[PDB]
Design a protein around this ligand. Structure first.
Ligand code: POV
Ligand code: POV
Ligand code: OLC
Ligand code: OLC
Ligand code: OLC
Ligand code: OLC
Ligand code: PLM
Ligand code: PLM
Ligand code: PLM
Ligand code: PLM
Ligand code: PLM
Ligand code: PLM
Lengths: 174, 134, 134, 133, 141, 174, 174, 174
């Protein structure tokens, strides 16, 4: 099952990265009522856009800044440091996965892939919690669910990467 | 608005339930990772340990390493806050306008999930059989 | 009129109690089956495991199979909802004819069931003895 | 009347606390007898019952039918009594809004705790000196 | 008129005074040290396992091990009693403290009301991974 | 004990099937006050019938249909799919029990009997919950309790059937 | 430790019987306000008696009878069946303890002593619960606490008797 | 590691004793508003002293005595028996630690050090609880935190002393 494990890892790593990059880029996180200049809007991390009215398709840069704890929440939300960090770590995880095909001598590469993917998922959870907490009728759109599916896939890939490394250290010791 | 079939979920927002599930996966994966580094905490037993902790039931096994116990300890703390919040706030929803008994209709949804789960378990058992038979 | 010896049943409708008992049997039988598919979960231990889970106690066994853990997990979920609902307002039902201590008369029935059970246990023990002495 | 040092006992009448203790002894003795006539000798029977009541669990669980009858009714008794205590405790803690408990309100539980630790150390010295001679 | 302040990230601490929290921590250490001592007097209750046992008891979880000696069981028994009183008191009105707006009926809890519990959790998982890398690199040398 | 186990199984299977078929057919599920077309009535899954008055013994078909969740409950209650499915599975369980005497070569027949009886009981629980939930002073009659006794017997027979199969696979392996 | 165990058993059995017989006979169960013909009284299972006034030392028999559950409670309380049964069982326990010195062949005698003492204590608990429940400012007197100490001693003696029997069956089998 | 363990023990014992003695002596337990004979004050176990005004640095003895439970609390608080007992036990612990270097023959000396330090910490907890309970806007000063750090150090030293004794009894038995 070495081939299938590496297939799942590689496809999974690409899937997770793609989903998360789309999610960070696109603007269908939240469907709330508001204004793109109130009307039904679709927002994301960066922009809010109207979907009914004369300005349908207009998008305005969110004003993240319209108590230390409140300020910190606004700052962390504004930067989207945690969603971006999750994309970065998924990028490096996939990089390690690629590098594991060449440098077979050094087994720690695939493990580091694993740790990147696990960490990417932790960064993702923090991001979601910051996003929802900062927003305090509404509904979440497909960009939101892409971030959520990225978390699930990253955690599955982390587990498979760690299994690959374990099989390696248990085959060659014996 | 009449209380739904799944009204027992109502004391917590949908987003808490979703984040509980992500937290559950995160905790289980990290517990597996730290342990395969330190009857053992492979992924399936990590999932089982976390689930039992959360549901206040216990488990065959308990982490022995320092990093395993850090993970276990923070999950226990999280559990104590979240479950306590659920039952505190549940009590409030159950007494909001006398002492009236709950009716079967008020909890029927929990019975449907239960029998659904038993059905799924039997299905999974037939598969896991037929797979191991061939 | 003072509340009855079995007032501890009052927070739930009779039909919930009946369904809890059927659910208990269902869960116990399905656990037995899935487990004789993948100490061990014979029927008596399945009954004991389910009872302990429901009473929030736990015992000397936990399922190891995937199908056993599905059954266990949904029963744990069921238990958390039902016990939380039952325990919310319990003391109010025990004393319903300001904030006062419970009195022994309010819980006497729980004591009668307990001493009755101890009597029954001693009787069953004498039988199981005399049967095995023959 | 101001709430006493042991006000945490207040949700149950004195006679319930007394009867809980007698019930605890009765259950423990009957569990020992039905099991003997990792094992349920008297000291482990006492430990099993105590853990069940305090919602902690134990090393051991009865395997016999009569042991499980005793265990099962004690679990049932525990669920009713503890649930009644915490239900009714909640009522006592909010009776004249969201006011934090003060150390003075729970000091009595700390005195029992440190008392118990002292007693444990004393018993440990005895159990030592006895086994040393 | 200022807008009504939302409760803090650490609002889950609010049901108990700061001094109770401090004393719970000292009580936890005291219990753990006394359990270790009585147990070495007569797996096993070394200091790390004593700390783990006490923490699990307090959090209403349980763990691998339970004391076997009389003095160990006295310590365990009083800590169980302490735990039952303190946790019962803490959990009574907890959701009320998590959702209380103050000036410097029944709603669902929101993620913002419990976000702090999530930050502690993910922080702890991060710390656990860090500690695991250290304990590795130390043992790799 | 092979004989006694198979006796319990066969009698039990017949008992459970009979009880459940009577229960589905008969009309003493509920004693509530109402109208056979208010007066004291006795109802079942299909019909309502009067116990007092000039119309005593007149019996009218239930109007099951006088939110998706509410609609589903009404539909499932109206069909009585779950009580009927319970009867069907008990029928097939008993069929397998009979077939276990003849074609003994295949051991799995008695096991399948077991699974049918276990499943019949799960179908029965769902039925009861749908019945009670859809009805939301009253009392349950003997038809109701026949359904309940069928559940208990089916679960006992399922357990015994599974024991028979275990004894078989533990005798013939050694 | 055979001698010490039998000493504890015999003294204990006598203590428990004596305490319980005094308790059933005497009249200092409850100190409440009332009338012996309101004044401070001391009552027992059978009689109420005044402690202050012109009638100090006058004692009237209790009217136990001044819902099925209420009737049963009154009846069981009136008879004092459970305190009397506890005295009877303690009597037979002590009888068996005596008989254990003669008929050493039959080991079950000391065990039966044990079971009598354990049962006496269960009868005692029921009695206390019936007494307190039927009474629904007051205080319990020394007769009450004698019943309570009898329960504790009976349970200790039951445990020691059972230990004696275990030592016997573990010495002679080996 | 024998040297390091004994260094930690000896330094630790001195630290704990020093911290606790300072704490009992000094008067920065509590910063509340009051009167040195209302103004901002700093108090301790024994004295209250002003921080603002013409009387800044005037310092008056506390009147501990301006229900049995209340009386006991006042008495125990007034004496400061528990903080003083903590200092005494730390003194004897350190004494034993010193004596462990000279008369090495008896191993129990270092164990007794351990028990003294553990007990010192229990005395300290009781003291804190009595102090806080008897005081029922305020804040705790550095004297208070010295008592708290003494507790932590004493418990660490108790643990290390007990470890020393263990490897002594595990070295010399084998
Ligand atoms: C490793 C795995 C981890 C997870 C495990 C966890 C397991 C969870 C298991 C299962 C999840 C729950 C499934 C059932 C829920 C239906 C309720 C419903 O929709 O109610 C509606 C009313 O409906 C009624 O009034 C009719 C009730 C029908 C009973 C369905 C039981 C099916 C049992 C046989 C199943 C066959 C077996 C195969 C099934 C897979 C209204 O609701 P809504 O508003 O429309 O929404
Ligand atoms: C197998 C065994 C099973 C049972 C085990 C269970 C263990 C239970 C253990 C012990 C039971 C509890 C004992 C302490 C309770 C005192 C509280 C008190 O009276 O408060 C008063 C206020 O008092 C104050 O304000 C001062 C507080 C003094 C603290 C006492 C701690 C002693 C520690 C060192 C002990 C030395 C060690 C040796 C001791 C033996 C008011 O209360 P009251 O209204 O007057 O009443
Ligand atoms: C190895 C691990 C074993 C795994 C064992 C898992 C079982 C435990 C949990 C079951 C909870 C079931 C969740 C039920 C969710 C119902 C959601 C729902 O009904 O949503 C309605 C919605 O709100 C529109 O109104
Ligand atoms: C083998 C088993 C090991 C045994 C381990 C035992 C520890 C468990 C329980 C301790 C509770 C302590 C009892 C606390 C009682 C306090 C009573 C009290 O303070 O009474 C005041 C009175 O009401 C006037 O106001
Ligand atoms: C023995 C094995 C190791 C197990 C270890 C894991 C157990 C962790 C449990 C709970 C953590 C809770 C701590 C949260 C405290 C943070 C808040 C606080 O203390 O104060 C806030 C701030 O100081 C003012 O604003
Ligand atoms: C598998 C090992 C065996 C373990 C077995 C022990 C478990 C006992 C648990 C609970 C008993 C509670 C029963 C109480 C019900 C009595 C009241 C009742 O049923 O109804 C009252 C009456 O019918 C109308 O007034
Ligand atoms: C690893 C560390 C990750 C966990 C910490 C997450 C903190 C981000 C939350 C920002 C708001 C916090 C606040 O308001 O205090
Ligand atoms: C630990 C895992 C907890 C599982 C129980 C809660 C699941 C409910 C989810 C429902 C929802 O998403 O609305
Ligand atoms: C196992 C369960 C054992 C229960 C038996 C005892 C029941 C008798 C107590 C009820 C008497 C009454 O109050 O009418
Ligand atoms: C099981 C044993 C429970 C012990 C805890 C409660 C003890 C309190 C008794 C106090 C009293 O009698 O007033
Ligand atoms: C073991 C306990 C680990 C706790 C460490 C995480 C704490 C960081 C989260 C708080 C961040 C904030 O909200 O300011
Ligand atoms: C063994 C049998 C002993 C347990 C049953 C005790 C019954 C006595 C209580 C009488 C009042 C009960 C009632 O009110 O129904």
């Amino acid at each position: 099952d070495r081939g299938i494990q590496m297939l799942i890892t590689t496809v999974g790593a690409f899937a997770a990265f793609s989903l998360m990059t789309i999610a960070v880029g696109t603007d269908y996180w939240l469907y709330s009522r508001g204004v793109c200049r109130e009307v039904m809007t679709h927002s994301g991390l960066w922009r809010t856009c109207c979907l009914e009215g004369a300005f349908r398709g207009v998008c305005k840069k969110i004003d993240h800044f319209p108590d230390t704890a409140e300020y910190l929440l606004r700052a962390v939300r504004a930067s989207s440091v945690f969603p971006i960090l999750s994309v970065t770590l998924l990028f490096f995880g996939g990089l390690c996965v690629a590098a594991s095909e060449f440098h077979r001598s050094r087994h720690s590469v695939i493990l580091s892939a694993g740790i990147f993917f696990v960490s990417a998922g932790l960064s993702n959870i923090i991001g979601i919690i910051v996003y929802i907490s900062a927003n305090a009728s509404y509904s979440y759109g497909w960009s939101f669910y892409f971030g959520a599916f990225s978390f699930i896939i990253a955690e599955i890939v982390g587990v498979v990467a760690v299994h690959i490394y374990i099989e390696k250290h248990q085959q060659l010791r014996a | 608005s009449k209380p739904g079939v799944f009204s027992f979920l109502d004391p917590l927002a949908y987003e808490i339930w979703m984040c509980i599930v992500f937290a559950y996966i995160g905790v289980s994966v990290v517990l597996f990772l730290v342990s395969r580094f330190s009857n053992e905490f492979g992924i399936f037993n990590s999932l089982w340990f976390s689930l039992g902790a959360f549901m206040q039931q216990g488990c065959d096994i308990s982490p022995r390493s320092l990093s395993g116990r850090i993970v276990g300890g923070v999950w226990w703390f999280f559990t104590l806050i979240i479950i306590s919040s659920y039952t505190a706030n549940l009590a409030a929803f159950l007494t909001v306008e006398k002492t009236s008994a709950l009716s079967l209709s008020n909890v029927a949804g929990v019975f449907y999930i239960l029998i659904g789960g038993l059905g799924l378990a039997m299905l999974v058992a037939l598969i896991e059989f037929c797979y191991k038979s061939r």
